[PDB]
Design a protein around this ligand. Structure first.
Ligand SMILES: [Cl-]
Ligand SMILES: [Mg+2]
Ligand SMILES: [Mg+2]
Ligand SMILES: [Mg+2]
Ligand SMILES: [Mg+2]
Ligand SMILES: [Mg+2]
Lengths: 231, 226, 250, 244, 204, 243, 195, 196, 241
């Protein structure tokens, strides 16, 4: 109200409204789902078009051979944060001959987002990210909020109507965590999860975006006829 | 250059010769080498003459501001600390070799400082090209518990040794006596043992000896009214 | 962090007034009375040592300050602002003059430097004006004796005699009746003490009054002998006893 | 953060005016009147000190008329402290030019430089402008005797006769009435003092309330002399012109 | 190669009874090649005179610098600078270039307008002040000038006697220096009149 | 009014309302505690299980600084991470210059001065965390708690977050009933109980217990997380006490 | 480059500058114009290190042209030469100094006088009746010292200049491929196309 | 220069000659090379006098500021501060410093910091130009846990030999004793140590 | 009304942010007192440990700035420690640059100058503390110099700070009106501490245990704080006469 003019101002109840408004941009964004087993981690994203002449906005970005994310909210902010992740993954490989742990990647994203919430002149990032990866401790899924909060999960969803997919994953938890050594079935579970967030529209061939990373699987994005198999 | 410093009963005395040279040529025959850092802190400089003057005035200036800031009379250890840190920073490029002496509320002090920023404490010190001649005298006649009169005598004798034996030193002896609870007394040309003898001939020319091409009045006045 | 106030805090109002300068002058008006009187052979500056507590040692608080050996200053208004200005004035006398010309600045030019510092606090980013008016008395070889007033705006004026602060209006009228161009320093001191008594409520003695003069050279205060051209400072702060002696002939 | 307290000194009004410049001009309208009159054989600068005191040391006092170099002087209307900042900068510019070209700076080049500095404070930096208007009186061998004025906007113009400060509307009308092109310095001296005498807010115009200066080729032969009038000399010219 | 002896030239100053004299040769050269016989090395700012020997570009630069500074001094101080004050200004200005100095040998001469006392001073290239009572010398024939001055000089010479002494000191010193000569100027300075005299001398 | 709209502004009371609003964010956070034992310290924190999808034991909250200091905080988690990152820089530079690991009081002031610096300007926001931290140095065990204002003191026991009142009361009982002191293994058990008891203020969702400790005898003065059997033993002890 | 000469006569300044450009072993050009017009009545010839000569000359030219436009006024030769001197005096204590020597020939329209200024790369300025840079003076000055008169016509100046060039062509070891000659007077600058 | 520091039962003792030379000229024959950086942390200086004085002054400042914040520093901490300055500025320094101090917890400790800026904790250390001549003697005669009197004799005899052979060393032998009892200064004149 | 938010002048020529910083000074509800002996300077301050979970040894508003200078603070602890750290840095730097220990009055002036800057510069807030510096200066002897958020400072014969400063001040004033000297005429610092505690008891009308007080003592060449047992010995001596 009087306390939402900038990110440097607490409200009387201890809230940061600019951060909360940045969180609101994610809720307006298109739904994207993340889930994993013990061998693979999967991203499923519903891409959004402007109209029937337009392309469908890409949602998934590769960060390294073993890591990448999907976005919901301001796409340019995702580009900034994913670029930073690419650099950090790269720094780890060049300097230490070491693949950047997914958990450490989450810590780096948290700290980068935090600096934009405590200083004058800046603004919070207006995007949510779902980071998947396969490192020395197996498959991982992270959820990033521009408040700085990063959380490691078995499965989750962000964006508009993401609650439907999240409840489904909460039911299916015991099933999809056991889908080891079967990439197609794990993706199926993700496609079924994201379906719980659709209304009026359904998953078409240029609508759906899927990514997967795993034990012997570099981070690869599937679009177009490569996802027709799952429709 | 010959400069010395000698501690005594109730204070300290510094002395110096008055010859400044450019190679083998004497630039000034009555040079003033005793510099005032503050009313009761004086020092004598050897080496690059501009550097000894400049570093003395800079520290002297900052010492004055420090004295005003703290409402206290300046201390010799402050002048010493400021001088050495300045000289060390410039890694010997400021060619100032100084003997710093003075009295302050803490007592009487005598220090030497070299261009590289190294300092020393002593009851008797000498610096410059005539320092070995001076130190020979100091090592021969110095004793503990010198009186004011004995210290002035010893200091000036040490400078004389430089004057007569060192080609880099000559002319007159300048002295400054700093006694506890007294005004520092600066004794310019304390000794004058090198007055030139009368010349054999007057070289005053007859007027009109020099050939002149043109004469003119030089306007040193500002633009005039009316 | 970083100073993000890079904009002026003093600005022109629709009427043409610079509010912060006016308000600084209001703070000066609330300040204790200080005055200056110029004689033929000297200048006197005086003020009341308004002690904040009787447990406070008011001798440790110097309202009259030596800037150079021949220049002194007194103020009315905010004490802390004065104290830092004295530090800056002392330094600028060296950096912008003595280290260049090998001599102390003439009164008018030191006043000019102080004035410039005060002007800049009136225009520079993220600062308020100084809440003091200064009276600067001094002597130099070519201008003789002089007395200047410097205001929060940075404006300065030379005076024969003046007063600033609390009872300045009444004090200036008192000075107008008494001042002439034939006053000797002792006459000016006498008039200063008379003028200052009117604005002082409580105790009026050498311990509650601060008074200094710019007069003859004091070779006894030089600290060394041997250089004929160096004859000592013209600034001299009168002692508590010296003030009381002149309060009997009052 | 800090934005909250920013007055924004360098913005246009909806009418396309610079607030701070306009308000600085309002401030200058309360300053003592300064007048410049250009004649064929020299320039006159006359200016009124603001309500003075009998205890003010006039002979060592300077608030209106300043020397920039031997050929150029200025009359000030506004904040004296602000003016001295600009005056010192102008003095340095003149010397920089003299060092570079080994010739005295032409009057307009100096005026343009100071005016550009004023302009900068109205467009960038977020600082308040200088509350000063100058009358420049100067001579160079290109245009001869010149009068200019500059104000807080950084705009400058050339004049035959001009006033700044208080009552400029009344002053300018009086100057426009009696000024002629073939006028001489002694006539211009009289016009300037007569105009001040009529426009002044004081009861009477006396020597202690005035600063006066002339720039004349009344310097012996092919050169120019600046004359900052002494208090006694202002008193004499007041009697000569029949004002006191 | 040595910057202080590329262009050549000399300046000498002397004190007399209620007067000072400052004199210089007129040569500017490029080592062996004579370039100009009208390169005056003495300048004045009000009543204070400054002679400068050494590298000619610095001679010109410093003259312009001290004209610059004495002009601002006068505007602010409302009076002409004095020889004693100007001497300190020269020293300060030279020392500020301590590690990249002007290759010059300045000489100040003048009479204090208030005390009437004659004043001379010399400097090394980095600002050290030589304030002699008798005479100051500078330039590529400074050794020769020292020899001439030391024998020819006597104190309290009248203006017209001082002229002969300083002229003969300059002329004969210059004639024993390859890089000095090609004309000479002598200033005789009294409290409120200064006379400038160009001397006739050999042109080789 | 308007005094609460900008950090570093004194209200007519002499208060910095923006700092007081930061405290509200701390009070909104989960419960974290610290217990000073005989030769060390124990830290424990309540981790609210927002969903079944949270991977157990993965979202670690307690942070190590150097090798001997543990840090836990309640409020805005990112702010706490930022503070710990600074603390790690402070500890590194101290050890770099002075060789010895940073003493706990020395470390406390480093955090304190940094947090206090964020109450000096309107261009920064105060920290939305209260941090409980400590460890073992050459003078023994030290436990500290640091508020948004920069204020910190040494503690026998410390608590912050939503269930701080409950926790404090429990800590006060331990101080009274054990003037001679508490063992490190006892403190771990007690820490588990107190977090379980303090979870009544957050009873809607279930939680995960996280404990760490530095002890001269039990961990060689190094900070370690309580894992496996020792953690389960503490959970069992805690569950027994609430029933 | 090599030879640049200047002579100030009664009513004009004449600048003669060699045409050769030699890069070590070969003469790359024999028609090089080592001069720049700074203003309608001011010409500057130059010689020194390769690249720096033209760079400096064009830099000066640009600055004087800028001044001319700003003030709608042509600076006096004296003012231009002072500006140039300061630039070189500034340059000599730079990281990499301009190794450029110049002659500035200008006709002062105010004083109705020709003026020749000689400035070397150090910023050493002298006003002369005739001047040169490098070794050019060593061969030519004895001829100029003998024949020069301040009341010479432009035609007499050119004839004396021819004698100087002939002596250079005789005794100088280097082939400088003749000279381009330009005259600066009240009507401006023009090139003598047969020399 | 001949300098050494020797740990013993009750703490540590620093020893030094007093000769400072400029070439073959003895610029100071009564130099104090035993320098206090803290109450019971002293050092022996060798190399450039300007450098070692500058370093010591900076260390004394650092330990004074350390003490105001964190209480008494350890000898190890002092050695670390010396090392930091010597190592990081190795290109521009000629300094060989021995650091000696007394804690109550650690007792007597000696650290030597040679030219490169490395640190070496030793039971005793020798340095300076004169030290070369007494490597044999010191190695043969040093014992751990000597008494105060034995350690004084060991240092006196050692530096006596260093002075005897090294022209750059001489004058008086200064010593500073660091124990729980406090700080004691000792001095030994030529007529004493030359007859040993 | 933004003239109340930053340090610019109000229409009355007042600085409200400075005035409100003075009010923050009493937020701790602690009173301090300083007196001078012949050879010493004593400072006492109330100690309140309201929480049983606190380590009472870490609760302090007295600071050892240098070997010779002590400082007691009236105001919140974050600003107190801010000032303490700076004062320590300033004192250490002074000794390094000028070769002698920073005098108490000079440090007070320096900290007062820093405070003055916060009252003039908008981006910096005043510190809500009053700083009382104590020492036995090598030139001036026993010294008390106090600094406040306005950037004001002055020397004191004795002084008091806190919510009940007036009661203590008047009590001290009345004693020095009797004795007619500028100090406590006592040889040992122990008895000067006893005087200080006795007169605080009289002025406040409250009794003290060993844990209710905090004591700092400055002697020649050192400032030190008393332990609870040292204070207990002091309290016993007071009660026994
Ligand atoms: Cl300060
Ligand atoms: Mg010759
Ligand atoms: Mg010849
Ligand atoms: Mg070195
Ligand atoms: Mg030996
Ligand atoms: Mg402020």
């Amino acid at each position: 109200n009087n306390y939402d003019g900038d990110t440097v101002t607490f409200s009387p109840t201890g809230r940061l409204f600019q951060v909360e408004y940045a969180l609101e941009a994610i809720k307006q964004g298109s739904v994207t789902v993340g889930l994993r087993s013990n061998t693979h981690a999967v991203l499923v994203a519903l891409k959004r078009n402007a109209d029937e002449l337009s392309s469908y906005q890409k949602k998934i970005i590769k960060c390294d051979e073993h890591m990448g994310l999907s976005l919901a909210g301001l796409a340019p902010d995702a580009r900034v944060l994913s670029n930073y992740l690419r650099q950090q993954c790269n720094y780890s490989s060049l300097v230490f001959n070491r693949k950047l742990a997914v958990e450490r990647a989450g810590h780096l994203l948290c700290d980068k987002a935090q600096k934009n919430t405590q200083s004058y002149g800046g603004r919070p990032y207006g995007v949510g990210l779902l980071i998947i990866g396969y490192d020395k401790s197996g498959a991982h899924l992270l959820e990033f909020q521009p408040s700085g909060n990063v959380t490691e999960l078995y499965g989750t969803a962000i964006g508009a109507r993401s609650q439907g997919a999240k409840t489904y994953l909460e039911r299916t938890l015991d099933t999809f965590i056991k889908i080891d050594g079967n990439p197609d079935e794990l993706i199926k579970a993700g496609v079924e999860a994201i379906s719980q967030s659709l209304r009026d529209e359904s998953l078409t061939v240029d609508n759906l975006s899927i990514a997967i990373v795993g034990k012997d699987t570099p981070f690869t994005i599937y679009d177009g006829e490569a996802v027709a198999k799952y429709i | 250059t010959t400069i010395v410093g000698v501690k005594f009963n109730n204070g300290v005395v510094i002395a110096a010769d008055t010859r400044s040279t450019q190679g083998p040529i004497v630039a000034d025959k009555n040079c003033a080498k005793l510099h005032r850092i503050s009313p009761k802190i004086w020092c004598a400089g050897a080496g690059t003459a501009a550097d000894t003057e400049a570093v003395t005035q800079l520290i002297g200036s900052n010492i004055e501001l420090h004295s005003l800031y703290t409402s206290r009379e300046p201390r010799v250890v402050s002048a010493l600390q400021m001088l050495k840190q300045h000289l060390f920073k410039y890694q010997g490029h400021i060619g100032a070799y100084l003997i710093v002496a003075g009295v302050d509320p803490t007592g009487s002090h005598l220090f030497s400082i070299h261009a590289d920023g190294s300092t020393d404490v002593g009851y008797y010190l000498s610096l410059g090209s005539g320092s070995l001649a001076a130190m020979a005298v100091l090592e021969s006649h110095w004793k503990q518990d010198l009186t004011k009169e004995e210290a002035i005598k010893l200091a000036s004798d040490a400078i004389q040794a430089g004057i007569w034996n060192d080609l880099g030193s000559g002319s007159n002896v300048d002295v400054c006596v700093m006694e506890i609870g007294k005004d520092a007394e600066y004794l310019r040309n304390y000794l004058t043992p090198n007055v030139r003898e009368e010349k054999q001939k007057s070289y005053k020319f007859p007027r009109g000896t020099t050939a002149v091409l043109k004469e003119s009045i030089v306007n040193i006045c500002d633009i005039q009214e009316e | 962090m970083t100073d993000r106030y890079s904009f002026s805090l003093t600005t022109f109002s629709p009427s043409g007034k610079l509010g912060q300068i006016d308000y600084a002058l209001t703070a000066v008006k609330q300040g204790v009375t200080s005055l200056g009187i110029k004689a033929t052979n000297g200048v006197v500056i005086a003020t009341e040592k308004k002690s904040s507590s009787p447990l406070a040692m008011s001798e440790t608080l110097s309202k009259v300050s030596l800037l150079t050996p021949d220049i002194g200053a007194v103020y009315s208004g905010m004490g802390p602002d004065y104290r830092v200005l004295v530090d800056k004035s002392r330094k600028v006398a060296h950096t912008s003059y003595k280290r260049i010309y090998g001599e102390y600045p003439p009164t008018k030019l030191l006043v000019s430097e102080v004035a410039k510092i005060m002007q800049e606090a009136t225009q520079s980013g993220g600062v308020r004006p100084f809440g003091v008016s200064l009276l600067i008395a001094g002597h130099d070889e070519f201008n003789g004796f002089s007395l200047y007033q410097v205001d929060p705006s940075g404006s300065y004026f030379p005076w024969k005699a003046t007063a600033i602060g609390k009872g300045s209006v009444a004090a200036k009228t008192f000075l107008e009746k008494r001042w002439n161009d034939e006053l000797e320093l002792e006459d000016a001191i006498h008039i200063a003490l008379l003028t200052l008594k009117e604005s002082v409520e409580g105790e009026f003695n050498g311990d509650t009054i601060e008074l200094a003069i710019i007069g003859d050279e004091n070779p006894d205060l030089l600290g060394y002998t041997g250089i004929p051209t160096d004859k000592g400072p013209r600034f001299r702060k009168l002692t508590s006893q010296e003030i009381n002696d002149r309060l009997e002939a009052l | 953060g800090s934005r909250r307290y920013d007055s924004r000194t360098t913005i246009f009004s909806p009418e396309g005016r610079l607030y701070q410049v306009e308000y600085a001009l309002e401030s200058i309208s309360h300053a003592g009147t300064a007048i410049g009159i250009m004649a064929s054989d020299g320039i006159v600068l006359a200016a009124e000190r603001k309500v003075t005191s009998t205890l003010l040391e006039q002979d060592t006092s300077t608030e209106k008329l300043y020397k920039l170099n031997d050929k150029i002087a200025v009359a000030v209307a506004g904040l004296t402290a602000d003016a001295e900042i600009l005056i010192n900068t102008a003095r340095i510019h003149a010397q920089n030019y003299l060092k570079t070209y080994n010739e005295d700076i032409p009057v307009e080049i100096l005026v343009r430089r100071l005016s550009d500095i004023k302009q900068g404070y109205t467009q960038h930096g977020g600082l308040r402008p200088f509350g000063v208007s100058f009358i420049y009186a100067g001579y160079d061998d290109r245009y001869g005797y010149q009068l200019y004025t500059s104000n807080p906007s950084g705009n400058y113009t050339g004049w035959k006769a001009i006033s700044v400060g208080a009552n400029t509307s009344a002053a300018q009308t009086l100057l426009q009435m009696d000024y002629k092109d073939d006028m001489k310095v002694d006539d211009a001296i009289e016009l300037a003092l007569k105009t001040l005498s009529k426009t002044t807010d004081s009861s009477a115009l006396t020597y202690d309330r005035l600063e006066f200066a002339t720039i004349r080729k009344g310097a012996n032969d092919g050169e120019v002399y600046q004359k900052i009038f002494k208090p006694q000399e202002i008193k004499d010219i007041l009697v000569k012109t029949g004002i006191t | 190669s040595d910057p202080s002896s590329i262009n050549g030239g000399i300046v000498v100053a002397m004190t007399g009874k209620d007067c000072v004299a400052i004199a210089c040769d007129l040569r500017l050269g490029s080592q062996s090649l004579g370039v100009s016989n009208k390169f005056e090395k003495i300048f004045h700012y009000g009543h204070v005179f400054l002679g400068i020997t050494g590298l000619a570009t610095d001679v010109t630069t410093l003259n312009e610098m001290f004209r610059y500074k004495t002009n601002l001094y006068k505007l602010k101080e409302e009076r002409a600078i004095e020889p004693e004050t100007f001497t300190q200004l020269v020293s300060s200005s030279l020392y500020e270039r301590r590690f990249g100095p002007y290759f010059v040998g300045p000489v100040v001469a003048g009479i204090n307008s208030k005390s009437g006392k004659p004043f001379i001073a010399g400097f090394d290239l980095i600002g050290c002040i030589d304030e002699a009572k008798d005479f100051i010398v500078s330039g590529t024939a400074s050794d020769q000038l020292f020899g001439m001055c030391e024998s020819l000089y006597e104190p309290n010479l009248e203006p017209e006697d001082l002229f002969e002494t300083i002229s003969q000191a300059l002329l004969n010193a210059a004639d024993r220096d390859a890089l000095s000569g090609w004309g000479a100027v002598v200033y005789i300075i009294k409290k409120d009149e200064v006379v400038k005299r160009y001397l006739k001398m050999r042109q080789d | 009014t308007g005094y609460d709209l900008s950090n570093s502004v004194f209200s007519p009371d002499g208060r910095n309302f923006q700092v007081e609003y930061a405290v509200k964010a701390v009070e909104n956070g989960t419960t974290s505690i610290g217990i000073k034992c005989n030769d060390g310290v124990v830290f424990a924190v309540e981790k609210l299980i927002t969903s079944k999808l949270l991977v157990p034991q993965k979202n670690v909250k307690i942070q190590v600084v150097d090798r001997h200091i543990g840090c836990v905080y309640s409020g805005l988690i990112p702010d706490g991470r930022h503070l710990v990152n600074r603390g790690r820089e402070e500890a590194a530079s101290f050890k770099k210059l002075y060789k010895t690991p940073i003493p706990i009081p020395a470390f406390a002031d480093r955090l304190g001065q940094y947090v206090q610096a964020h109450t000096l300007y309107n261009s920064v926001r105060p920290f939305g965390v209260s941090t409980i931290f400590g460890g073992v140095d050459k003078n023994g065990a030290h436990l500290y708690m640091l508020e948004p204002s920069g204020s910190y003191w040494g503690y026998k026991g410390a608590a912050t977050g939503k269930g701080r009142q409950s926790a404090k009361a429990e800590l006060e009982k331990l101080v009274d009933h054990h003037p001679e002191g508490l063992s490190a293994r006892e403190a771990v058990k007690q820490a588990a109980k107190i977090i379980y008891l303090a979870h009544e203020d957050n009873k809607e969702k279930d939680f995960e217990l996280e404990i760490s400790w530095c002890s001269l005898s039990e961990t060689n003065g190094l900070h370690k997380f309580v894992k496996g059997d020792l953690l389960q033993e503490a959970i069992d002890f805690a569950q027994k006490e609430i029933n | 480059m090599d030879i640049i000469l200047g002579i100030r006569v009664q009513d004009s300044v004449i600048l003669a500058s060699s045409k050769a450009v030699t890069r070590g072993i070969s003469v790359l050009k024999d028609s090089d114009d080592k001069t720049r017009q700074l203003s309608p009545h001011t010409l500057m010839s130059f010689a020194g290190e390769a690249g720096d000569t033209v760079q400096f000359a064009e830099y000066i030219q640009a600055n004087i042209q800028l001044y001319s436009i700003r003030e709608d006024y042509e600076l006096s030769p004296q003012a231009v030469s002072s500006f140039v001197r300061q630039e070189l005096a500034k340059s000599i204590r730079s990281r990499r100094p301009y190794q450029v020597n110049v002659l500035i020939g200008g006709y002062d329209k105010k004083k109705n006088k020709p003026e020749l200024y000689q400035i070397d790369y150090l910023g050493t300025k002298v006003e002369l009746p005739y001047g040169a840079h490098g070794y050019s003076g060593f061969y030519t000055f004895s001829l100029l010292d003998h024949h020069y008169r301040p009341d010479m016509t432009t035609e007499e100046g050119l004839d004396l200049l021819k004698l100087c060039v002939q002596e250079l062509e005789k005794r100088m070891p280097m082939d400088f491929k003749g000279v381009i000659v330009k005259i600066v007077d009240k009507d401006g600058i023009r090139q003598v196309d047969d020399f | 220069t001949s300098i050494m520091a020797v740990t013993f039962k009750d703490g540590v003792i620093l020893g030094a000659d007093s000769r400072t030379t400029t070439g073959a000229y003895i610029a100071n024959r009564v130099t104090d090379k035993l320098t206090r950086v803290h109450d019971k942390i002293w050092c022996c200086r060798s190399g450039s006098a300007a450098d070692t004085q500058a370093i010591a002054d900076i260390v004394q400042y650092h330990l004074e500021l350390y003490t105001s914040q964190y209480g008494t520093p350890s000898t190890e901490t002092a050695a670390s501060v010396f090392k930091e300055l010597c190592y990081e500025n190795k290109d521009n320094l000629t300094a060989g410093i021995i650091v000696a101090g007394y804690d109550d917890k650690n007792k007597g400790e000696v650290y030597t910091i040679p030219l490169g800026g490395s640190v070496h904790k030793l039971p005793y250390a020798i340095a300076g130009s004169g030290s070369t001549f007494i490597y044999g003697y010191c190695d043969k005669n040093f014992r751990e846990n000597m008494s105060k009197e034995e350690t004084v004799d060991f240092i006196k005899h050692s530096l006596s030999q260093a002075i005897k052979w090294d022209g750059s060393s001489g004058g008086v032998i200064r010593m500073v004793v660091l124990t729980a009892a406090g700080v004691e200064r000792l001095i030994f004149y030529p007529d004493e140590y030359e007859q040993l | 009304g933004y003239d109340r938010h930053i340090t610019i002048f109000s229409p009355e020529g007042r600085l409200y942010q400075v005035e409100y910083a003075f009010k923050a000074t009493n937020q701790t509800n602690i009173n301090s007192l300083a007196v001078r002996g012949k050879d010493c300077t004593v400072v006492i301050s109330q100690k309140k440990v309201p929480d049983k979970l606190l380590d009472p040894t870490t609760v302090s508003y007295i600071f050892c700035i240098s070997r010779t200078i002590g400082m007691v603070v009236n105001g919140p602890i974050p600003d107190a420690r801010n000032a303490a750290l700076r004062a320590k840095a300033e004192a250490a730097e002074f000794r390094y640059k000028y070769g002698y220990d920073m005098p108490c009055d000079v440090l007070a002036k320096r900290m007062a100058n820093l405070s003055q800057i916060y009252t003039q510069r908008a981006y910096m807030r005043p510190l809500g503390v009053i700083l009382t510096f104590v020492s036995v200066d090598e030139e001036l002897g026993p010294s008390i110099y106090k600094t406040d958020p306005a950037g004001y400072y002055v020397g004191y014969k004795a002084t008091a700070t806190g919510p009940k400063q007036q009661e203590i001040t008047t009590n001290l004033e009345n004693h020095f009106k009797k004795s007619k000297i500028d100090h406590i005429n006592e040889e040992s610092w122990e008895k000067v501490v006893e005087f200080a505690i006795t007169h605080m008891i009289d002025a406040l009308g409250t009794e003290f245990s060993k844990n209710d007080l905090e004591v700092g003592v400055a002697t020649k060449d050192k400032f030190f704080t008393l332990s609870a047992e040292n204070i207990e010995e002091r309290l016993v001596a007071i009660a026994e006469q």
